[PDB]
Amino acid sequence: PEEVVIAGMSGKLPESENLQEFWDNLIGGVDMVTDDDRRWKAGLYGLPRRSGKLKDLSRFDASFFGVHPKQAHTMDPQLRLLLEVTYEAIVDGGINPDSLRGTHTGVWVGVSGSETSEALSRDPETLVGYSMVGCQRAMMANRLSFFFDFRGPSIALDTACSSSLMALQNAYQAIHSGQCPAAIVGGINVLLKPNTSVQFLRLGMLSPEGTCKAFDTAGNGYCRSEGVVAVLLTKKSLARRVYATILNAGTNTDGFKEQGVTFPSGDIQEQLIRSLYQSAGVAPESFEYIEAHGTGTKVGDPQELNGITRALCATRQEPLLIGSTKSNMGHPEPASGLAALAKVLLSLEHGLWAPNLHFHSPNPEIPALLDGRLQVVDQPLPVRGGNVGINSFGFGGSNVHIILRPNTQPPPAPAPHATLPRLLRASGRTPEAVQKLLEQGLRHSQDLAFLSMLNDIAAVPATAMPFRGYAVLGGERGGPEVQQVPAGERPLWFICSG
Amino acid sequence: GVHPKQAHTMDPQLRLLLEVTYEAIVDGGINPDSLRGTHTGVWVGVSGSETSEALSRDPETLVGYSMVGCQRAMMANRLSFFFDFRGPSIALDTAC
Amino acid sequence: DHSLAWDVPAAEDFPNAAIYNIDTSSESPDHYLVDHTLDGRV
C-alpha cells in the first residue's frame, strides 16, 4: 500500500465564509456561536438561545455548475454549498479538476439531516419532481460525482456525530487499497427545523446556556451548529500540497451497554486507539495533540478523557496536549470530525494551536487534568512536533480515530534562478476573482510553489470562467491586467520576421 | 429489551429489521451468542425516515425517544447494540 | 458570482382552530361544571 495524504481543504463554518476567517476566529478567541434569530425566533419551544450558524445560505452560482434556476430553487442548501466547497478544496491542492475527470475518484459524504426534502414535499398538489433529484440524501454525493465526472464510489453515510470522520476513514481505506487514486470527503449540516432541536433537548443532549464547555466542571451539554467542509484525499504521486499523512484510520461500535444505547463507553474507545497506534507502529510517546470529541457532556467527557489517559498516557513523561474545536464554534453533528480536522490542519500550517474556550476549572472526575498528564490548550502554544490524533464518537456508538503525521517540509534554499521575473495568470467568474488572485500572487511573489500552484489551476475554459488576467511578478514594472475572454477557440499563428 | 413507550416511538423498519437479523443469524446455524464481542459489522441501506417526520410534527408533545429510535444512523447502531457487535456500523444511502 | 439569491426553507415551512378540553375532575379548573346539572344529567 502507498501513502494517503490530504491535499486540499475548504469549508463554510459558523461566522466564517472561508477557512481563513475560521482561523482568524479560532486564534482571535472570538465566540462563533451567536445568539441572533436568523434561523428562527430565539427561545422558541424553550430551545437554547445560542447556536452556530453560517453567514448566508442563499448564494449559489448556478450557471457554473449547470443548474437551471428552477432546479436551484429546489436544491438543498447543503448541496449548493457543498458543490462550491468541493471545487474550492480541489483547487486548494493546486489540482486542476479537469485532470480528475474520467478517473476513479470516490465521493464519500456524511449527512444526518434531510430537512429541506420535507419542506419541499409538503404540498402534493403543487410540488415539483425536481426536488427528488436535488434534495435526496444520496444526491449529496451523486451530484458531485455527476458534475466532476468521478467514476468511483458515491456513498452518503449516515452515522450520527461521526459521519464525516467515517467517510474520511472509508476514503482512506479505498485509496490505501488501490481502488481509487483520490477521494472527496465531505460533511454537511444545516439547522432548519426547530423540531430536531426540540428532540435533542428532550433527550437531554443540549446545554441550557448554549455553550459547549469542554473539559469543564459545569459541562451541561452541547450547542447545535451548522457547517460544510470538504477534504481532497489523494495518494502521494498526485498531491501537490500535503497538509498531513494519514498514518492509520479505524472504526468500531461500542456494542452492548448496560446504561443504554446513548451512554458513551471508554473501554471500546481505548481499544480502538490502542489498536490503531499498534498497527501503525507509532509509539504513544510520539503523540503531541489529540482532538477530543469534547462535547461538554457530564458523562461523555470523563469517559473519553480517561480512555485517552489509559491508552496513551501510560508511560510518557511529557504531558499530552488535548483540545476540542467544539468550544469555539459549537458542534456540527455530522461534520464534527471534519471541523476538528480543519482546525488541526490550520494550526499545523500556522505553527500555533488554537486555544480552547470556556475552560476555567478542570473536571474533578478526570485525574489526568489535575495530575498534569493531560493539558488543555487554553493559550496559543507553538508546535514542537510529533503526531496528532482525531477521534469522533457518535451517540449511537460509532467510534472513529485517525493519526496524522504533519508536514515538516522547510522552505527551499535560495537559488540563483529565483531572482528572474515570473509570470502569474489567473481566471475567474467575475473581475473580483481575478483581482484577488493577482493580489495574492503579488503578496507572496517570492514563494515559487504558491505561484506554481496558482498557475496550475488557471487553465479553465472561457465558457466556465469568462474573465482572465495576468501580472508579471518581480519585474521592473507592470501591474495587473484583466479582461473578458471572447468565446470560441481562436487559432494561433506565427510570423517570422526577416 | 425495548420498553413499550419506546416501541411505539420506533420506526417499523428497525423492528422488522431486528427480527429479520435474528432470523438470518439463526438460519446460518450459528448461535447469535457466538458473535457477541466480535468484530462483526452492520451495514444497512436506507433511503427514508418518514417515521421521524411523523413523530416530530408536534413540538409540544414529542418525546425524545423518537431520535434514538427513528434516527437514520440507529438502524444499524441498534442492531450492533442489541447483538453486541464491535465492528463498523454504517447506514449507506445510495439510491436503489 | 453571487448576484442572485435562491430559495431557502423557512421556519414556518415545517409542522408545529381552537381546541378546548372540558374536564370535570376535581384537580381541573373546570371542576365547577359538575354543579350545572339538569334533569339528573350534567
Short mmCIF file of N, CA, C and O in Angstrom, two decimals, chain A residues 45 112 118 136-138 154-160 166 170 193 195-196 198-200 202-203 251-257 260-262 268 395-396 398, chain B residues 36 39 46-47 53 56-57 59-68 71-74 77 80-82 84-95:
data_model
loop_
_atom_site.label_atom_id
_atom_site.label_comp_id
_atom_site.label_asym_id
_atom_site.label_seq_id
_atom_site.Cartn_x
_atom_site.Cartn_y
_atom_site.Cartn_z
N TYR A 45 -40.04 27.26 21.72
CA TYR A 45 -40.19 25.94 22.32
C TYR A 45 -39.21 25.71 23.46
O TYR A 45 -38.94 24.57 23.83
N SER A 112 -26.59 13.76 8.11
CA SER A 112 -27.53 13.28 9.11
C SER A 112 -28.91 13.90 9.00
O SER A 112 -29.86 13.34 9.55
N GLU A 118 -38.37 17.55 3.36
CA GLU A 118 -39.70 17.62 3.95
C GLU A 118 -40.40 18.92 3.58
O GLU A 118 -41.60 18.92 3.26
N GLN A 136 -32.66 14.63 -2.32
CA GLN A 136 -32.49 13.27 -1.84
C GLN A 136 -31.10 13.09 -1.25
O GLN A 136 -30.12 13.66 -1.75
N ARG A 137 -31.02 12.29 -0.19
CA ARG A 137 -29.77 12.20 0.56
C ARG A 137 -28.63 11.66 -0.30
O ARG A 137 -27.50 12.15 -0.22
N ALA A 138 -28.91 10.65 -1.13
CA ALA A 138 -27.86 10.09 -1.97
C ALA A 138 -27.30 11.13 -2.93
O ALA A 138 -26.12 11.06 -3.29
N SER A 154 -19.87 6.47 -4.79
CA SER A 154 -20.62 7.67 -4.38
C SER A 154 -21.59 7.24 -3.29
O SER A 154 -22.71 6.81 -3.57
N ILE A 155 -21.15 7.36 -2.04
CA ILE A 155 -21.92 6.93 -0.88
C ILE A 155 -22.26 8.14 -0.03
O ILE A 155 -21.54 9.15 -0.03
N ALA A 156 -23.37 8.05 0.70
CA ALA A 156 -23.81 9.08 1.63
C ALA A 156 -24.04 8.40 2.98
O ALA A 156 -25.15 7.96 3.29
N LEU A 157 -22.98 8.33 3.79
CA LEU A 157 -23.07 7.68 5.09
C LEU A 157 -24.03 8.44 6.00
O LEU A 157 -24.43 9.58 5.72
N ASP A 158 -24.41 7.80 7.10
CA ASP A 158 -25.42 8.37 7.98
C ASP A 158 -25.12 8.25 9.46
O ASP A 158 -25.93 8.73 10.26
N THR A 159 -24.01 7.64 9.86
CA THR A 159 -23.71 7.51 11.29
C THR A 159 -23.68 8.89 11.94
O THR A 159 -23.11 9.84 11.39
N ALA A 160 -24.30 9.00 13.11
CA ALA A 160 -24.53 10.30 13.72
C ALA A 160 -23.32 10.77 14.51
O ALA A 160 -22.68 10.00 15.23
N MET A 166 -16.13 8.99 9.58
CA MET A 166 -16.32 7.68 8.97
C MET A 166 -16.10 7.74 7.47
O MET A 166 -15.51 6.84 6.87
N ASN A 170 -13.35 5.71 5.29
CA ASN A 170 -13.66 4.91 4.12
C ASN A 170 -12.83 5.36 2.92
O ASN A 170 -12.33 4.52 2.16
N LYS A 193 -34.93 22.97 10.88
CA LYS A 193 -36.16 22.56 11.53
C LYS A 193 -35.99 22.61 13.04
O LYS A 193 -35.18 21.85 13.59
N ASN A 195 -37.83 21.45 15.27
CA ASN A 195 -38.31 20.25 15.94
C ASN A 195 -37.18 19.28 16.24
O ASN A 195 -37.24 18.55 17.24
N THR A 196 -36.14 19.25 15.40
CA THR A 196 -34.98 18.41 15.71
C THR A 196 -34.28 18.90 16.97
O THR A 196 -33.85 18.10 17.81
N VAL A 198 -35.76 20.46 19.38
CA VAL A 198 -36.64 20.08 20.48
C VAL A 198 -36.43 18.62 20.86
O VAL A 198 -36.40 18.27 22.04
N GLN A 199 -36.28 17.75 19.86
CA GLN A 199 -35.99 16.34 20.14
C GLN A 199 -34.71 16.21 20.95
O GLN A 199 -34.68 15.53 21.99
N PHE A 200 -33.63 16.85 20.49
CA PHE A 200 -32.36 16.75 21.21
C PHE A 200 -32.48 17.29 22.62
O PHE A 200 -31.94 16.70 23.57
N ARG A 202 -35.17 17.33 24.49
CA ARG A 202 -35.93 16.37 25.28
C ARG A 202 -35.05 15.20 25.70
O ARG A 202 -35.13 14.74 26.84
N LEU A 203 -34.20 14.72 24.79
CA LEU A 203 -33.28 13.65 25.18
C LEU A 203 -32.34 14.10 26.29
O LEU A 203 -31.89 13.28 27.09
N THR A 251 -12.30 2.19 12.97
CA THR A 251 -13.64 2.42 13.49
C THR A 251 -14.11 1.18 14.24
O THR A 251 -13.59 0.08 14.03
N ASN A 252 -15.09 1.37 15.12
CA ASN A 252 -15.70 0.26 15.84
C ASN A 252 -16.88 0.75 16.67
O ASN A 252 -16.93 1.91 17.07
N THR A 253 -17.83 -0.14 16.95
CA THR A 253 -19.03 0.20 17.69
C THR A 253 -18.91 -0.26 19.14
O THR A 253 -18.21 -1.22 19.45
N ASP A 254 -19.61 0.45 20.03
CA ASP A 254 -19.49 0.18 21.45
C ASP A 254 -19.97 -1.23 21.78
O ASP A 254 -19.36 -1.92 22.61
N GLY A 255 -21.05 -1.67 21.16
CA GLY A 255 -21.62 -2.96 21.47
C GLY A 255 -22.72 -2.84 22.50
O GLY A 255 -23.40 -1.81 22.56
N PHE A 256 -22.92 -3.87 23.31
CA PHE A 256 -23.93 -3.79 24.35
C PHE A 256 -23.44 -2.92 25.50
O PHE A 256 -22.25 -2.88 25.82
N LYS A 257 -24.38 -2.20 26.11
CA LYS A 257 -24.05 -1.32 27.22
C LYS A 257 -25.22 -1.31 28.19
O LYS A 257 -26.36 -1.04 27.79
N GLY A 260 -27.26 2.13 28.44
CA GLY A 260 -28.18 2.42 27.35
C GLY A 260 -27.42 2.57 26.05
O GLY A 260 -26.20 2.47 25.99
N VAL A 261 -28.19 2.81 24.99
CA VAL A 261 -27.60 2.97 23.66
C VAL A 261 -26.83 4.28 23.57
O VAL A 261 -25.76 4.35 22.95
N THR A 262 -27.33 5.34 24.20
CA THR A 262 -26.76 6.67 24.09
C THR A 262 -25.70 6.97 25.15
O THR A 262 -25.22 8.10 25.22
N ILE A 268 -14.08 0.67 24.93
CA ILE A 268 -14.07 0.45 23.49
C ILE A 268 -13.21 1.50 22.80
O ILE A 268 -12.44 1.19 21.88
N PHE A 395 -23.48 9.26 19.10
CA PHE A 395 -24.33 8.86 20.22
C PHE A 395 -25.00 7.52 19.99
O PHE A 395 -25.76 7.06 20.85
N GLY A 396 -24.75 6.87 18.85
CA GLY A 396 -25.21 5.52 18.63
C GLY A 396 -24.12 4.51 18.94
O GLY A 396 -24.37 3.31 18.99
N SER A 398 -20.73 4.73 17.34
CA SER A 398 -19.84 4.53 16.21
C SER A 398 -18.59 5.38 16.43
O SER A 398 -18.65 6.61 16.33
N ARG B 36 -21.12 -12.43 19.70
CA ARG B 36 -21.06 -11.32 20.64
C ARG B 36 -19.61 -11.03 21.02
O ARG B 36 -18.82 -11.95 21.26
N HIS B 39 -15.84 -8.67 15.99
CA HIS B 39 -15.77 -7.51 15.11
C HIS B 39 -16.76 -7.60 13.96
O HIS B 39 -16.49 -7.09 12.87
N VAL B 46 -30.70 2.44 3.67
CA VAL B 46 -31.97 3.08 3.94
C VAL B 46 -32.05 4.36 3.12
O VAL B 46 -31.04 5.06 2.95
N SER B 47 -33.24 4.67 2.61
CA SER B 47 -33.47 5.88 1.85
C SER B 47 -34.78 6.53 2.27
O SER B 47 -35.56 6.98 1.43
N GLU B 53 -40.45 12.12 10.55
CA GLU B 53 -41.34 13.21 10.17
C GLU B 53 -42.69 13.07 10.85
O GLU B 53 -43.29 14.07 11.26
N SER B 56 -42.02 13.88 14.81
CA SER B 56 -41.51 15.19 15.18
C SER B 56 -42.38 16.32 14.64
O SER B 56 -41.89 17.44 14.44
N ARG B 57 -43.66 16.05 14.40
CA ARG B 57 -44.57 17.03 13.85
C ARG B 57 -45.36 17.78 14.92
O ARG B 57 -46.23 18.58 14.57
N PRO B 59 -44.26 19.93 18.23
CA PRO B 59 -43.22 20.38 19.16
C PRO B 59 -43.62 20.28 20.61
O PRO B 59 -42.74 20.09 21.47
N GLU B 60 -44.90 20.39 20.93
CA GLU B 60 -45.35 20.40 22.32
C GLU B 60 -45.62 19.02 22.89
O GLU B 60 -45.88 18.90 24.09
N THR B 61 -45.56 17.97 22.07
CA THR B 61 -45.89 16.63 22.52
C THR B 61 -44.82 15.59 22.23
O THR B 61 -44.89 14.49 22.80
N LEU B 62 -43.84 15.89 21.39
CA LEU B 62 -42.88 14.87 21.00
C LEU B 62 -42.03 14.45 22.19
O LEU B 62 -41.70 15.25 23.07
N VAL B 63 -41.67 13.17 22.21
CA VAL B 63 -40.78 12.61 23.21
C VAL B 63 -39.41 12.42 22.58
O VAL B 63 -39.29 12.11 21.39
N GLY B 64 -38.36 12.61 23.39
CA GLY B 64 -37.01 12.49 22.88
C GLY B 64 -36.66 11.09 22.40
O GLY B 64 -35.66 10.93 21.70
N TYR B 65 -37.45 10.09 22.77
CA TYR B 65 -37.14 8.72 22.37
C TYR B 65 -37.19 8.53 20.86
O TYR B 65 -36.59 7.57 20.36
N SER B 66 -37.88 9.40 20.13
CA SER B 66 -38.00 9.22 18.69
C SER B 66 -36.65 9.34 18.01
O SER B 66 -36.34 8.58 17.08
N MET B 67 -35.81 10.28 18.45
CA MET B 67 -34.49 10.43 17.85
C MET B 67 -33.66 9.17 18.02
O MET B 67 -32.98 8.73 17.09
N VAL B 68 -33.71 8.56 19.22
CA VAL B 68 -32.94 7.35 19.48
C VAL B 68 -33.54 6.12 18.83
O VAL B 68 -32.89 5.06 18.81
N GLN B 71 -33.96 7.73 14.25
CA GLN B 71 -32.83 8.32 13.54
C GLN B 71 -32.27 7.34 12.52
O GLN B 71 -32.26 6.13 12.74
N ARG B 72 -31.81 7.88 11.40
CA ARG B 72 -31.32 7.03 10.32
C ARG B 72 -30.13 6.18 10.76
O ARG B 72 -30.06 4.99 10.45
N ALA B 73 -29.19 6.78 11.50
CA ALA B 73 -27.99 6.06 11.90
C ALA B 73 -28.26 4.98 12.93
O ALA B 73 -27.40 4.12 13.14
N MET B 74 -29.43 4.99 13.58
CA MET B 74 -29.74 3.98 14.57
C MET B 74 -30.24 2.68 13.95
O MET B 74 -30.33 1.67 14.66
N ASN B 77 -26.97 1.06 14.34
CA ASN B 77 -26.47 1.16 15.71
C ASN B 77 -27.31 0.33 16.66
O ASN B 77 -26.78 -0.29 17.59
N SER B 80 -26.27 -3.33 16.21
CA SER B 80 -24.98 -3.57 16.85
C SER B 80 -25.12 -3.57 18.36
O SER B 80 -24.49 -4.39 19.05
N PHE B 81 -25.93 -2.67 18.91
CA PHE B 81 -26.12 -2.60 20.35
C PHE B 81 -26.73 -3.88 20.88
O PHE B 81 -26.21 -4.49 21.82
N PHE B 82 -27.85 -4.31 20.30
CA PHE B 82 -28.52 -5.50 20.81
C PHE B 82 -27.66 -6.74 20.64
O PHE B 82 -27.47 -7.51 21.58
N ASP B 84 -24.49 -6.90 20.18
CA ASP B 84 -23.15 -6.71 20.73
C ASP B 84 -22.08 -6.97 19.67
O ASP B 84 -21.23 -7.86 19.79
N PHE B 85 -22.14 -6.17 18.61
CA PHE B 85 -21.15 -6.21 17.54
C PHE B 85 -20.19 -5.04 17.71
O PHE B 85 -20.62 -3.90 17.92
N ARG B 86 -18.89 -5.33 17.63
CA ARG B 86 -17.86 -4.33 17.82
C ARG B 86 -17.30 -3.80 16.51
O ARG B 86 -16.35 -3.01 16.54
N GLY B 87 -17.85 -4.21 15.38
CA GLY B 87 -17.34 -3.77 14.10
C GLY B 87 -18.00 -2.50 13.62
O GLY B 87 -18.70 -1.81 14.38
N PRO B 88 -17.79 -2.16 12.36
CA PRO B 88 -18.40 -0.94 11.81
C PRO B 88 -19.92 -1.02 11.84
O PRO B 88 -20.51 -2.09 11.73
N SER B 89 -20.54 0.15 12.00
CA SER B 89 -21.99 0.28 11.93
C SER B 89 -22.29 1.50 11.06
O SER B 89 -22.15 2.64 11.52
N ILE B 90 -22.71 1.26 9.82
CA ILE B 90 -22.91 2.32 8.84
C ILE B 90 -24.31 2.21 8.26
O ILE B 90 -24.94 1.15 8.28
N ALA B 91 -24.80 3.33 7.74
CA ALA B 91 -26.11 3.41 7.10
C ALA B 91 -25.94 4.06 5.73
O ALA B 91 -26.07 5.27 5.58
N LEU B 92 -25.63 3.24 4.73
CA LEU B 92 -25.47 3.73 3.37
C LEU B 92 -26.80 4.21 2.81
O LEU B 92 -27.86 3.66 3.11
N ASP B 93 -26.74 5.26 1.99
CA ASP B 93 -27.95 5.82 1.40
C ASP B 93 -27.73 6.14 -0.07
O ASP B 93 -28.13 7.21 -0.55
N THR B 94 -27.10 5.23 -0.81
CA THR B 94 -27.06 5.35 -2.26
C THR B 94 -28.35 4.77 -2.82
O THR B 94 -28.73 3.64 -2.50
N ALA B 95 -29.04 5.55 -3.66
CA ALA B 95 -30.42 5.23 -4.01
C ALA B 95 -30.48 4.00 -4.90
O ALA B 95 -29.74 3.89 -5.88
#
